[PDB]
Symmetry: D2
Subunit: 141 residues, 4 copies
């Protein structure tokens, strides 16, 4: 099915100068960018975005990191997008990504498990929530 | 239950100068305004907002009217908000509203069935869709 | 000359429930609302908005107050708007406003000099800066 | 001097799939992206953006083209940005760009004089206007 998923380019990848290369990859893989913007999470908004993981040990570190500098979000649309985008980004741990998926976003631009370049929706339920969290319908063009 | 609903002040009420009086009413009724903005629907975006009614005879007239001038949307939060807000706005037909609910928004500021001052979400399912259509999570404060 | 000015309803007036009454007043005085939204200043953005006053003794208190809860900004357009809006809001000190301008916004909804309900651009130069700080051209409708 | 300029990636370059490659170039040239978003000009907003050129013979064609599909704007910051960005994009006519500046944005991704991939502010005065037209201060991060 044609699906929409949310990616967020994280501050580590922003700082490395990888934004354009990352967007280029998803464009060349055939996804339509339906929304795109640079913004800065406040710590409160980062915590709301990541609500489902609020009880995890790493949560405060994640919130701080994702509000530590500007990020860029995009809505990607295409066939099987949620799973296909997860394949393109690679394993959570950027070092594992380098071993098993060398051309994945995280292999190319990630550092480790925390600074791993990019977020993507992990499921249709999270995609629905995450897209609405960042973009209104008025912003989808 | 505490709920969120979407209202939109329509161009007829905007033109009458009723915006402030309408917002004042919902504030005094005890609703929290969680998001608020003036914007202009393009005809395409109005048609998407009203997707569920696309097959109704009045649809093109509605789309045109709701894209004919700027509107103001607000997210209202409170106990039983969806139904309570519908009570405050009154019957669809502003003339009927004057007969049965004289202090309702539509009695006070509506003209007829089409120019009836204000839209409100009609159900929890529509509220979910409508709020996301107009406001991202980043805009709810 | 027809001018545009920026008002911001401050958190004290928001909390008092005065938003609708304040907007109603400017509408009835004949101003066109060209842009309107609820948002929350981060402390950094409040400090940038108030850049010209950064060296004043009250600056940190002002920044904190204006980022302490959501605010609503509006662009008002009309003949001589910058000065006329300043007249409508009244003296900086809400207590003085009650003595000399009883129907002014600050007399009606202000508390003292700091919690004084509303900000308005003080000059054409500040209006130009302030309007752009809060609203893009795309948001003026 | 450190300056800010506005670029807009036009619908021809969007359709060619060049967005990421174009952003990558400006990042690698050392510009800071201070704001970024995808949006769609209405014809009215395109005409306002291009107000200074409203009397030119090509104006309606330009307005139509720039409102014919989504575009992406970015604010670029760096030393001598306005002139340096103009150098990077190359001559107005993409065919001339291919002859004299083969690695310029317009040589790489432009088609002709009208479909020439990208807009950039032509002066500090236009940059000031254009940046405010598309982005508020709240959107610069």
């Amino acid at each position: 099915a044609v699906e929409r998923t949310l990616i967020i380019v994280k501050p580590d990848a922003m700082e490395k100068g990888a934004l354009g290369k990352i967007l280029d990859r998803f464009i060349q893989e055939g996804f339509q960018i339906k929304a795109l913007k640079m913004f800065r999470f406040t710590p409160e908004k980062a915590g709301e975005f990541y609500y489902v993981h609020r009880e995890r040990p790493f949560f405060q570190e994640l919130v701080e990191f994702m509000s530590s500098g500007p990020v860029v979000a995009a809505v990607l649309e295409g066939e099987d997008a949620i799973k296909r985008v997860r394949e393109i980004i690679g394993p959570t741990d950027s070092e594992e990504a380098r071993k098993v998926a060398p051309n994945s976003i995280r292999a190319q631009f990630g550092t480790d498990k925390g600074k791993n370049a990019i977020h993507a929706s992990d499921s249709p339920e999270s995609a629905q929530y995450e897209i609405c969290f960042i973009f209104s319908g008025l912003e989808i063009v």
